[PDB]
Amino acid sequence: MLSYRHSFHAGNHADVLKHTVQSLIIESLKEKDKPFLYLDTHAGAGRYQLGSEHAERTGEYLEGIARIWQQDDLPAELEAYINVVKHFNRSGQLRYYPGSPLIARLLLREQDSLQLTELHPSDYPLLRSEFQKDSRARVEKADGFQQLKAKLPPVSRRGLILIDPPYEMKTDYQAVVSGIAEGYKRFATGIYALWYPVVLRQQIKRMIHDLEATGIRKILQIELAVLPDSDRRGMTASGMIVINPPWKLEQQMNNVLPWLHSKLVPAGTGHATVSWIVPE
Ligand SMILES: C[S@@+](CC[C@H](N)C(=O)[O-])C[C@H]1O[C@@H](n2cnc3c(N)ncnc32)[C@H](O)[C@@H]1O
């Protein structure tokens, strides 16, 4: 029960993909002056210490953010995200990694809003202190999936909903789908970004089945695999499923995925794809 700790994984290849997509979506939303909501259902601590014992045990950040953040030929699509990372590592050494709530905190504007939830008794107080005196943000110790009912639609009528669970309980694979259907019912023009791991390809196929069955349209799938699928290799890939993706997102991902994959996976194994689960 809440035994998952994101500090082991912070800044790994999956975070790099996830936060790339988050930032691009946010930048798109800012192309209109009107305010929007950023909703993070499973928000985490806010930032992560990479020198921590948990990070270095896996050291997964070494094969993720570390391989891209100082590249001189960084694609223009990655600048906003990487400039947030640099902000938290101004010494030029990689010591801290910003979670989704801090990427949002620095990319959102004065008029925009954040609604964040985190249940874990270590991570919640940490997240709360990240947002003291930032009156744009509401931070609660509550179930994230329940927010898709309670907080939608936003008063602004615009927004990004990031659903990023740890999949520690297998039930998450169903809960993400029913959660999205509940959210969509309330706010059908929302942008929903669902992160998923590939541990067993089986469970992803089924999840995508259930998503298709909701009848929701306009669903984009972005996946980066560092290894081919297996049933004995832990997490070999991760992806972002985006409902109502912004107009440029498909092209931006086509622009940046080959570079990303080349940097994250120098051996060239696995794959990286962008395609539609359900077209318009
Ligand atoms: C991996 S993290 C997400 C990190 C964050 N979104 C980021 O990008 O930096 C998943 C988190 O969800 C929390 N959690 C698990 N179940 C939850 C629930 N039902 N509601 C809210 N938070 C949950 C965990 O404690 C953990 O911090």
UniProtKB/Swiss-Prot annotation:
GO:BP terms for this protein? Answer: carbon utilization; rRNA base methylation
- GO cellular component: a single term: cytosol
PANTHER family documented for this protein: RIBOSOMAL RNA LARGE SUBUNIT METHYLTRANSFERASE J
Q: What reaction(s) does this enzyme catalyze? A: adenosine(2030) in 23S rRNA + S-adenosyl-L-methionine = N(6)-methyladenosine(2030) in 23S rRNA + S-adenosyl-L-homocysteine + H(+)
Its domain of life reads Bacteria
In this chain, S-adenosyl-L-methionine is annotated as bound at H19, H42, S100, E118, D143, G144, D164
The note filed under miscellaneous reads: Recombinant protein prefers protein-free 23S rRNA to ribonucleoprotein particles containing only part of the 50S subunit proteins and does not methylate the assembled 50S subunit. Recognizes a minimal substrate corresponding to helix 72; this shows that RlmJ requires only a small hairpin for activity and this suggests that RlmJ can methylate A2030 before the 23S RNA is completely transcribed, processed and folded. Cannot modify single-stranded DNA having the same sequence as H72.
The similarity annotation says: Belongs to the RlmJ family.
Q: What is the effect of changing H6D?
A: Loss of catalytic activity
| Enzyme Commission number(s) from the entry | 2.1.1.266
For the site Interaction with substrate rRNA, which positions are given?
Answer: Y4
Its name, as the record gives it, is: Ribosomal RNA large subunit methyltransferase J
Q: Does the keyword RNA-binding apply?
A: yes
For the null mutant, the annotation states: The inactivation of the this gene results in the complete loss of A2030 modification, but does not cause the accumulation of ribosome assembly intermediates. The phenotype of rlmJ knockout gene is very mild under various growth conditions and at the stationary phase, except for a small growth advantage in anaerobic conditions. Only minor changes in the total E.coli proteome can be observed in a cell devoid of the 23S rRNA nucleotide A2030 methylation. Mutants show a stationary-phase competition defect during coculture with wild-type cells.
Pfam families under this entry? Answer: RsmJ
Organism placement in taxonomy: Bacteria, Pseudomonadati, Pseudomonadota, Gammaproteobacteria, Enterobacterales
- Species whose genome carries this gene: Escherichia coli (strain K12)
Sorted keywords for this record are: Methyltransferase, RNA-binding, rRNA processing, S-adenosyl-L-methionine, Transferase
Whether DNA damage counts among this entry's keywords is: no
- Coiled-coil spans are none
- Please list the residues that make up the active site: D164 (proton acceptor)
Quaternary arrangement and interactors, per the entry?
Monomer.
Physiological role: Specifically methylates the adenine in position 2030 of 23S rRNA. Nascent 23S rRNA seems to be the natural substrate. Appears to be not necessary for ribosome assembly. Required for the utilization of extracellular DNA as the sole source of carbon and energy.
